């Protein structure tokens, strides 16, 4: 789409891949890939996006809402851009509802073909 064209310049953006495929992409290297992520379109909420990431070998999926100006909303958090959101979660942990055993910072990413 129009919003998805500027995301298409990033190596970690995979566009319209399914939940299952994205999970397997981030899970491929097992717990060695803790923190590895990608960004895709949501298949269940058209127009919205998803950050799929590896948490100690398992895939997690977090909704991302992009505003008209490209600001990124993650529930209660707000970021000027998707890139700022990624850089934030590379240096502070993702405050997931499963708390303690769910400690993760973003590391690398799965490169789109």
């Amino acid at each position: 789409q129009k919003t998805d064209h500027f995301l298409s310049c990033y190596p970690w953006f995979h566009g319209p891949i399914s939940r299952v495929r994205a999970a397997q992409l981030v899970q491929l290297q097992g717990p060695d890939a803790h923190g590895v992520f990608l960004v895709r379109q949501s298949e269940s909420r058209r127009g919205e996006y998803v950050l799929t990431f590896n948490l100690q070998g398992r895939a997690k999926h977090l909704r991302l809402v992009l505003t008209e100006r490209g600001q990124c909303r993650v529930q209660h958090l707000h970021f000027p851009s998707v890139v700022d959101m990624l850089r934030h979660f590379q240096r502070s942990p993702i405050p997931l509802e499963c708390g303690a055993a769910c400690d993760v910072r973003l590391s690398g990413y799965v490169v789109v073909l």
Binding site: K60, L62, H76, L96
Partner: peptide
């Protein structure tokens, strides 16, 4: 879909 706290 994960929920933040």
């Amino acid at each position: 879909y994960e929920l933040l706290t």
